[PDB]
Design a protein around this nucleic acid. Structure first.
Ligand SMILES: [Zn+2]
Ligand SMILES: [Zn+2]
Ligand SMILES: [Zn+2]
Ligand SMILES: [Zn+2]
Lengths: 1298, 680
RNA sequence: GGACUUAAUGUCACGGUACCCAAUUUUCUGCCCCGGA
């Protein structure tokens, strides 16, 4: 009669449940599901405190299981004392059934006994069972037991027996995933307890018969698991979160007062992102500020809150709290803002919710069976251990739910869904891989390796006998936690509108991912008679070595390439459980000490443990060669980009101190060696854009993108890319820059602005800048990526994928943003030499068929032959006597034609046209294209402070012309030709002479205002070039230098290729609308002349004491240079293409104006068309073809017919009419402004300049009397005559109206 | 106001269009979805100031939603219960509101009563009987008795009269109602006036009309439930209603779905059990004439064979049917769409050649097996051709199943070393069925044909041991043949050639002396045979032997396959492709334990590939019941090659088929062979 | 020491992967003359 004291310690998170009596337990479902967990009871009424009291019946069950296993491993003997089989059956009559009934199998042997066990004598097995005692099914004395187990109580070490449930446990949700579809169902939830602080329990065991102590002591040491974790048995506040919620509500109300409710989500994300920057960003005032203005800006940090700005309010909040820390403060503020916004705002309509199904504790009558199993005599049992590491090759993600819905002890309806999706961590902020996910992945791989298996059933009256379950009932794993504790990153995703190719409103959602390069421990144990070969195949499949990737997919979001791991540093050992059982029991199976086994030398191993040498190789296993290896294929390729690339990041532009408008994307990479995050980021392209491009290409190819919904759809797009009913069959990864070290300066600064249509000057507060990567035609960018394809694809889906690849290779889908002005154009693609041979064969054969170039029958210069009569005023004056005016106005309207039946982007219409145009660009006068980024590009500001000086635009040292200027120059001409609205117009401005009636926008006609909605219609200019709510159908690219004589070298003083210009200031409108009753005259155009020759010789006495710093200096290109650029179009009607071709080259004697210095005569250019290709997306996929002029002339004729039809007069008939453009009045007036009077040697050199001031100007000569005090007064020139003169072409201004 | 009214009118137009039985199930879902979207859009704004009509429409829409969800896995889904609960919760606040009208409350009580009736039908714990009775009485008190224009009040009245509430005052109006059908009138005549003549008269018409309705209809379930309720009261008319319903179902089932298909409603086992029990009870009565007793015992076997003729697969397996050229395009799609349309129709409107059992050759005896789950007893019907007589007997099977489970559990762990449980299983078979060794039941020296049932398909009935000191085996006196169902027998004349074909596909050459014999034909693929070569036999050979592995599908028997040097050949592919095996003996080495999945219950109906071979003209298949070594198979192949007309039982007798007392492994290795098929 | 807190000839919960579907992008030429009191 001796009493022993035992202790139980855990090494993993265990599970907990609430306590109910035996009768009351039947009402609940979680209580019946968790009968093998730890228990929890409340201490008080409406309380949050309690205790944990693991019972003695569970310990007795585990101990007797261990006793049975030990007796079976020795043929029913222990230390030479034989034992019988026992008893595990009770009759329904003459008694009552016990509380828990058995369902698994029972191990049996040969009894080899002479005496039947009875009350007077018994074997140790029957003594350990409570078989022949005075104690039965009803507890009476607590002294009648020959062996007794008590409850085990948690060791509250410090104090405060009032222990809260929220301080020990936490809630989590687990689900069950269908093998075939890949989608889960019928989830369930549980509780998990902290094993580092609360992991020890203490109890007592009483034995009153010394005949079974030797077996009981070994059985206590042979127990491995309890309550869902590995174990060992040894014989001895409101103020914070509430106040932050009040502050968040105040901030939200202040934002709502100004109608800015949509910025709350952006503010929440930006505040959460501050956890990676430290408190110095808010203490030292490092947040970015406005670009030019500091008040009335477009920023968000300068929005008034209760009379103060937002940055200051955040500073005071941080100074007020200062206790929880920086990370917790930022996280909680962001969470409160997000929750308030989500509740306030109240698409993807859902009718029903999700289902929570618990495995029912099945009960029946007459359904209990006893199934004994007797292992053979002489067989041996072993035990194998595997140790290694798991390395992340991609950013990973393990999903959890919102922390406000996982509080233990706590929780008409409409369905609302979250869009935040945090990641799983532990209490010390370290990344975690749970046991359940790893077990699920292992089961999924074993079923694939076997070739068959079962869908898991939860009733379970008879346990399954399939191939997978038999091996799964012998495997034990362990939990894994890393050594890294830094905050994660957030990734954004959106959805596009297939009809207008714009962002759908209200589709933003984000997620948190972990870094790539982290490592985790790995432990696996197998106990049996033979080591299986399917498990060896799985282990070799999960391992990487010398030209092999790791193929372990864990977690979620496998479609976008998240969560692929690899296994390394593998060692395998072996226990012998027949001859070395005592050493196994003494060492406790080395549980909790596997970390020391990974680094242990072979000469320090404990007795009984030896290395394993018969582990098979990769090529000797029949599985993994017909079941696992051909599961997924790999395609890898490189992309060449010869233009600036900008994939914008929207939160970094708000948190970084660089004060920049648009920057590129980059990510963080963890370095295993030296154990730190690398100190430099890596630029890349996200896998979601990579996936979306393919999806859109295939959808437009097949026509599935124009459907309404895909609820129960089975189209090609839904089969290849999946839907909400089945997972995808293709997985994408990132595209990474690989040649970024070759560039001296990887990023470039570029500026843009919008030009008004009436005044001709730049628009106020409309300038913006970007920071793209510096790509150039002779120095492109290299990006490398890959994707995976599942086996079983049909013969048509492969062709669709290859067609999408070919379409991407041909430059039909630019990467990033701003693709309509030349950003992110693809120049080529190279395929790796390890991809399947049939893929390359299809790429080569199914390549877009070779066009047959015509044998120069009509393949010369496409010349538009049309001569304009010109103006008679300068033709009759061959002695150059008259003086003209630098600009005039064009008046038409007011009748704008709008169309409500716009053309969509979601399909290739068969009767519409798509193709590409190539053209050149000659120059007729010197051209200036400044590089604004450097205000001191010539190094002349040191001697002359304040003197701005630039140089010609270039990338990496190559002269180029940006595509924005070409697009704007063409768009202005197209608007003027077809009588469209004023796209860019200064709305609110007032006039004063030497108060007026209205503003400038009020005097403009209502029909000329810019188009603002798709419901009213679109004018031809907005319908072709696009608007805010509609994407344009034309794209322009950059132009590169080809040849030409030289710069404009002139023999002066400072760099010979420069030229100091004159003054250039402030277009003023109160000269064409003099007295409060006149409408605006219209669009402004400049003339063609050679007034730049006068300034080249007036230099030097231009520099000397005339302008201190008002003027600038820049590099000037000469005349005779040639450039080349491209134009793209799609889904254009024939008259639109005809008009585009006509306005791109109006014929002979007509040219364009471009660049800086137009009123002085700089920038006269002439464009000629070189070729024209067209494709059509039909069933046979017709190839690229080169059109003749027999079609070009018809296109131009159709455009002319459309123009004369819009003319409105039926007197001018429609048919096959030779195009004479000077018949239409407004076109006749337009083509006179663009007339070049010196194209051929017919000099007729005019004289154009602005009038000088009154009498004492610098460059005024006595005589002509061409000053502003004469033609500026209503005595020699009436206002109406003035307006008529300035709204008319030549017939000059010098005498007057000659 | 007007906006709410206009939106409500549009929603009601959509709902009324969806209530039309002329619509298809595909468009009904979309229409209901649009209506629910409109109602939820209205509610999200006018949450509290909403009228009762909108709530009534929402409840009606959710009631409609609950109908379109079909079971997938033999269990009632949770989405149906969730939709019903949401509809009830939506109508509860409209009931609780203080409007004060009459028609509003009447319609709300109607919809709540029907929702609660459905919810109680599919779930009893969440909605008890007393609650339903109280709700129905309260709804009746409000005046929901317009039997002339609506059917839901008729349903309420029938449900009330099922519970025992008296309805004498409305009986004349209920009978006068035109919309009522024959089952409702029979229930009214039975439960109210305790009258039986009119009940029989209308029940006969209902059973006759059931002959043309697919089994997806709820009328079948209602009729079987009514028969069960009549039986539970110790009534008299059930013993004829069950027989009439069985006849109607047997006539209806012959619709030729891939020649063998079934829908699996939840019943169709209780109905057959009740019909079998009724026929047995009316046969046990004493009559001087023996012809009536012979006819009744014959009808017992007829019912057994009608039940065992086909198997049923679940809806989720029917949606994932692999595609083919002829049968898949037409028959599967037609059957599935017809079943779905029949299922959704009852919730909107209320309106070769089979051989004879006695055509056996002289000298044969046929034994039929039936496992009656209702009464928990087994059965065995025997027909003797030489005397033209019928007999039957009963036994208990609740311990043979436990012994079988022990044998299976030990075998799946220690294949050859579990031979000590096979002897126990055979002795238990011999003890449980003592009539196998009786001269009055089975005359000695005659051939015996076995037609087993659910879990008896896997018992080695030919290796029984008599319950005495040194009893003999069953195979030492008789010769045995097996057949999954009597309908699989067919006439056959052996106009066969004398060509022997071999097919083999193994990882290693376990058979080396074989494939070197000079008796094989000219179209053997002795190494690396593929599935395309099995379809190229056209001369109707004499003996075809295929050596390969097996692969079982645990859910769909059509996807079971043989592992050849290709993607494989499946159960459906053999039926669709192979056409040149008429009259040829087939020897298989596929160890049936790999062709069919293990069992975790009393009943299973998983057909093997031997049935597929028998359905395309093969005369017999020989294989092993469990896994043995290659030497035994090689010896069997040589012994069959030496001559082909020898009997298997002599071979099993002379090669240690009776050494279970001395060397159990020899018994284990020797009794694993059996022959499937019936020679004519 | 006892209780909150077990029942004893019978506990496969290591019997269940929080999984599935969405392109941070559409529109804009770094252009330029007449008055201040
Ligand atoms: Zn004993
Ligand atoms: Zn299984
Ligand atoms: Zn689709
Ligand atoms: Zn417009």
């Amino acid at each position: 009669d001796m009493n022993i004291t035992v202790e139980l310690t855990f090494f993993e998170p265990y599970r907990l449940v609430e306590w109910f009596d035996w009768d009351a337990r039947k009402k609940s479902h979680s209580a019946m599901r968790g009968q093998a967990f730890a228990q929890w009871t409340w201490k008080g009424k409406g309380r949050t405190a309690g205790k944990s009291f693991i019972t003695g019946t569970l310990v007795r069950s585990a101990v007797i299981k261990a006793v049975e296993e030990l007796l079976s491993l020795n043929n029913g003997k222990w230390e030479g004392v034989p034992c019988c089989n026992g008893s595990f059956q009770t009759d329904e009559s003459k008694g009552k059934k016990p509380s828990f009934l058995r369902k698994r199998h029972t191990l049996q042997w040969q009894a080899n006994n002479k005496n039947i066990c009875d009350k007077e004598e018994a074997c140790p097995f029957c003594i350990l069972l409570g078989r022949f005692d005075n104690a039965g099914k009803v507890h009476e004395r607590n002294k009648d037991y020959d062996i007794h187990f008590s409850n085990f109580d948690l060791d509250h070490k410090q104090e405060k027996n009032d222990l809260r449930l929220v301080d020990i446990a936490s809630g989590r949700i687990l689900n069950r995933v269908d093998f075939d579809t890949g989608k889960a169902k019928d989830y369930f939830r549980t509780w998990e307890a902290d094993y580092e602080t609360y992991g020890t329990y203490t109890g007592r065991i009483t034995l009153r018969n010394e005949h079974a102590k030797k077996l009981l002591l070994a059985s206590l040491g042979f127990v491995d698991k309890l309550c869902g974790a590995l174990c060992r048995i040894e014989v001895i506040s409101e103020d914070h979160n509430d106040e932050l919620r009040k502050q968040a509500e105040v901030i939200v109300e202040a934002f709502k007062q100004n109608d800015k409710l949509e910025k709350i989500r952006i503010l929440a994300d930006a505040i959460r992102t501050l956890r990676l920057h430290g408190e110095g960003v808010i203490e030292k005032d490092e947040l970015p500020d406005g670009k030019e203005e500091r008040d009335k800006g477009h920023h968000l940090w300068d929005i008034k809150v209760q009379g103060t700005a937002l940055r200051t309010k955040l500073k005071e909040l941080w100074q007020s709290n200062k206790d929880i820390g920086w990370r917790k403060f930022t996280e909680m503020l962001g969470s409160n803002l997000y929750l308030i916004y989500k509740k306030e705002t109240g698409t993807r309509f859902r009718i029903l919710g999700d289902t929570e199904y618990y495995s029912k504790a099945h009960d029946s009558e007459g359904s209990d069976l006893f199934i004994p199993v007797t292992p053979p005599e002489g067989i041996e049992t072993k035990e194998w251990i595997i140790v290694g590491r798991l390395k992340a090759a991609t950013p990973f993600y393990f999903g959890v739910q919102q922390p406000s819905d996982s509080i233990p002890g706590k929780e008409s309806l409409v369905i609302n869904e979250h869009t935040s999706f945090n990641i799983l961590l532990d209490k010390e902020n370290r990344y975690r891989i749970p046991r359940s996910a790893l077990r699920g992945a292992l089961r999924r791989d074993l079923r694939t390796a076997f070739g068959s298996g079962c869908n898991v059933s939860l009733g379970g009256q008879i346990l399954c006998n399939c191939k997978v379950c038999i091996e799964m009932r012998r495997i034990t794993l362990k939990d894994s936690v890393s050594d890294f504790s830094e905050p994660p990153e957030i990734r954004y995703r959106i959805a596009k509108n297939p009809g207008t190719a714009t962002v759908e409103d209200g589709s933003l959602f984000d997620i948190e991912v972990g870094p790539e390069g982290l490592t985790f421990p790995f432990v696996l144990r197998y106990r049996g008679h033979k080591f299986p070969e399917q498990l060896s195949s799985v282990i070799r499949y999960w391992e990487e070595n010398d030209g092999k990737n790791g193929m372990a997919w864990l977690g979620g979001l496998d479609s976008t390439g998240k969560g692929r791991f690899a296994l390394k540093d593998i060692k395998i050992f072996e226990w012998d459980l027949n001859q070395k059982i005592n050493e196994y029991i003494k060492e406790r199976g080395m549980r909790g000490k596997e970390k020391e086994l990974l680094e242990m030398g072979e000469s320090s191993l404990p007795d009984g443990l030896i290395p394993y040498k018969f582990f098979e190789e990769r090529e000797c296993l029949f599985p993994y060669k017909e079941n696992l290896k051909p599961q997924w294929s790999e395609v890898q390729y490189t992309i060449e980009v010869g233009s600036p690339l900008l994939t914008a990041d929207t939160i970094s532009a708000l948190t970084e101190p660089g004060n920049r408008d648009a920057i590129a994307y980059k990510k963080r990479v963890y370095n295993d060696g030296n154990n730190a995050i690398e100190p430099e980021p890596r630029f890349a392209v996200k896998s979601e854009t990579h996936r979306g491009i393919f999806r859109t290409a295939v959808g437009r190819r097949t026509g599935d993108l124009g459907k309404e919904d895909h609820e129960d759809c089975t189209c090609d797009m839904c089969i290849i890319f999946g839907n909400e009913h089945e997972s995808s069959k293709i997985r994408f990864e990132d595209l990474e820059l690989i040649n970024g070290n070759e560039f001296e300066k990887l990023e470039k600064h570029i500026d843009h602005v919008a030009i008004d249509r009436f005044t001709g000057g730049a628009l106020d507060k409309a300038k913006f800048d970007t920071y793209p990567l510096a790509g150039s035609p002779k120095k492109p960018l290299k990006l490398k990526g890959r994707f995976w394809i599942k086996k079983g694809f049909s013969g048509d889906h492969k062709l669709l994928i290859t067609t999408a690849l070919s379409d991407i290779r041909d430059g039909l889908y630019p990467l990033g943003s701003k693709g309509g002005v030349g950003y992110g154009w693809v120049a080529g693609i190279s395929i790796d030499d390890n991809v399947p041979d049939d893929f390359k064969e299809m790429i080569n054969k199914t390549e877009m068929p070779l066009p047959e170039e015509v044998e120069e029958s009509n393949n010369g210069p496409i010349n538009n032959d049309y001569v304009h009569p010109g103006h008679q005023s300068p033709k009759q004056d061959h002695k150059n006597k008259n003086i003209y005016y630098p600009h005039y106005f064009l008046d038409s309207g007011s009748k704008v034609y709008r169309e409500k039946d716009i053309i969509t982007h979601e399909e290739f219409t068969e009767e519409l046209l798509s193709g590409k145009i190539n053209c050149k660009l000659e120059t007729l006068t010197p051209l200036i294209i400044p590089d604004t980024s450097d205000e001191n590009g010539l190094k002349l500001q040191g001697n002359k402070p304040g003197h701005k000086n630039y140089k010609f635009f270039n990338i990496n040292g190559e002269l180029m012309i940006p595509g924005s200027e070409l697009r704007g120059m063409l768009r202005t001409h197209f608007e003027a030709l077809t009588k469209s609205c004023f796209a860019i117009f200064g709305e609110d401005s007032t006039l004063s002479w030497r108060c007026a009636s209205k503003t400038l926008g009020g005097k403009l006609d209502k029909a000329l205002h810019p188009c603002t909605g798709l419901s009213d219609g679109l004018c031809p200019g907005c319908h072709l070039f696009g608007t805010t709510d509609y994407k344009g159908r034309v794209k322009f690219g950059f132009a590169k230098y080809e040849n030409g004589p030289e710069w404009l070298i002139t023999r002066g003083n400072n760099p010979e290729r420069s030229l100091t210009l004159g003054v250039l200031e402030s277009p003023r409108p109160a000269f064409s609308i003099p007295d409060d009753e006149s409408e605006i005259p219209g669009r402004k155009f400049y003339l063609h002349h050679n007034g730049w020759r006068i300034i080249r010789q007036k230099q030097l006495e231009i520099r000397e004491t005339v302008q201190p710093e008002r003027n600038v200096t820049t590099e000037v290109m000469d005349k005779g240079n040639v450039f080349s650029f491209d134009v793209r179009f799609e889904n254009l009607r024939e008259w639109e293409l005809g008009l585009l071709l006509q306005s791109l080259d109006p014929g002979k004697n007509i040219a364009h104006k471009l660049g800086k210095g137009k009123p002085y005569g700089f920038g006269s250019v002439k464009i000629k068309i070189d070729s024209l290709h067209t494709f059509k997306i039909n069933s046979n996929n017709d190839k690229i073809k080169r059109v003749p002029q027999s079609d070009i002339r018809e296109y131009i004729n159709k455009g002319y017919q459309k123009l004369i039809e819009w003319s409105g007069n039926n007197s001018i008939q429609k048919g096959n009419v030779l195009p004479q453009w000077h018949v239409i009045p407004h076109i006749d007036k337009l083509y006179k402004l663009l007339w070049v009077p010196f194209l051929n040697d017919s000099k007729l050199e005019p004289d154009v300049r602005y009038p000088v001031l009154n009498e004492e100007s610098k460059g005024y000569i006595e005589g002509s009397d061409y000053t502003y005090k004469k033609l500026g007064d209503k005595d020699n020139l009436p206002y109406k005559t003035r307006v008529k003169g300035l709204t008319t072409p030549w017939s000059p201004w010098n005498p007057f109206q000659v | 106001p007007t906006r709410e009214d206009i939106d409500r009118k549009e929603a009601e137009r959509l709902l009324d269009e969806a209530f039309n039985p002329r619509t298809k199930p595909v468009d009904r879902k979309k229409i209901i979805n649009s209506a629910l979207k409109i109602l939820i859009g209205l509610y999200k704004e006018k949450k509290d100031d909403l009228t009762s009509a909108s709530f009534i429409s929402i409840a009606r829409a959710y009631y409609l939603v609950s109908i379109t969800i079909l079971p997938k896995g033999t269990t009632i889904p949770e989405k149906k219960k969730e939709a019903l609960r949401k509809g009830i919760e939506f109508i509860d606040r409209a009931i609780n509101k203080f409007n004060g009208s009459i028609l509003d409350s009447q319609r709300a009580f109607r919809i709540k009563s029907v929702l609660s009736i459905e919810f109680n039908r599919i779930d009893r714990e969440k909605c008890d009987n007393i609650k339903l009775k109280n709700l129905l009485n309260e709804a009746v008190d409000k005046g929901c008795t317009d039997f002339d224009t609506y059917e839901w009040d008729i349903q309420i009245a029938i449900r009330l009269c099922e519970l025992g509430v008296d309805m004498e005052g409305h009986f004349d109006n209920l009978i006068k109602s035109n919309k009522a059908n024959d089952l409702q009138k029979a229930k009214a005549y039975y439960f109210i006036k305790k009258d039986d003549h009119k009940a029989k008269e209308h029940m006969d018409k209902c059973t006759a009309s059931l002959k043309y309705t697919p089994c997806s209809h709820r009328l079948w379930d209602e009729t079987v439930g009514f028969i069960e309720r009549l039986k539970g009261d110790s009534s008299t008319l059930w013993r004829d209603f069950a027989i009439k319903t069985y006849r109607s179902c047997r006539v209806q089932e012959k619709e030729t779905g891939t020649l063998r298909l079934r829908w699996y409603w939840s019943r169709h086992r209780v109905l057959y059990d009740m019909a079998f029990l009724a026929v047995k009870e009316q046969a046990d009565d004493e009559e001087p004439d023996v012809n009536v007793k012979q006819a009744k015992i014959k009808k017992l076997a007829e019912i057994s064979d009608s039940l065992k003729s086909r198997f049923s697969l679940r809806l989720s397996d029917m949606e994932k049917m692999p595609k083919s050229d002829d049968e898949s395009n037409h028959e599967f799609k037609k059957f599935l769409d017809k079943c779905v349309t029949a299922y959704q129709d009852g919730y909107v409107i209320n309106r070769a050649k089979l051989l004879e059992l006695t055509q056996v050759p002289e000298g044969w005896v046929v034994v039929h097996f039936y496992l009656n789950k209702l009464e928990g007893m087994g059965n065995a019907i025997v027909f003797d051709k030489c005397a033209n007589s019928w007999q039957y007997k009963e036994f208990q099977y609740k311990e043979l199943f436990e012994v079988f489970l022990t044998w299976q559990a030990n075998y799946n762990l220690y294949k050859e070393n579990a031979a000590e449980h096979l002897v126990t299983l055979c002795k238990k078979i011999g003890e449980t069925m003592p009539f196998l060794f009786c001269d009055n039941f089975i005359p000695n020296g005659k051939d015996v044909l076995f037609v087993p049932h659910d879990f008896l398909h896997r018992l080695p009935l030919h290796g029984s041991i008599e319950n005495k000191t040194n009893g003999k085996l069953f195979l030492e006196n008789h010769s045995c043949c097996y057949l999954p169902a009597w309908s699989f027998a067919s006439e056959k004349e052996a106009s066969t050639s004398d060509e022997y074909v071999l097919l083999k596909n193994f990882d290693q050459g376990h058979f080396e002396t074989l494939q070197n014999n000079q008796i094989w034909g000219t179209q053997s693929v002795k190494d690396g045979a593929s599935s395309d070569d099995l379809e190229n036999i056209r001369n109707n050979p004499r003996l075809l032997t295929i050596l390969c592995h097996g692969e079982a599908n645990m859910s769909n028997p059509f996807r079971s396959m043989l592992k050849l040097a290709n993607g494989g050949i499946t159960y459906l592919e053999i039926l669709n492709s192979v056409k040149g095996l008429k009259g040829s003996q087939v020897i298989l080495g596929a160890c049936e334990t790999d062709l069919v999945p293990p069992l975790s219950d009393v009943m299973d109906e998983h057909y093997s590939v031997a049935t597929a071979l028998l359905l395309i003209g093969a005369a017999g298949v020989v294989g092993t019941m469990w896994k043995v070594r290659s030497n035994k198979t090689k010896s069997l192949i040589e012994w069959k090659l030496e001559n082909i007309e020898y009997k298997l039982n002599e071979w099993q007798k002379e090669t240690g088929g009776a050494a279970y007392k001395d060397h159990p492994p020899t018994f284990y290795r020797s009794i694993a062979f059996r022959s499937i098929g019936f020679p004519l």
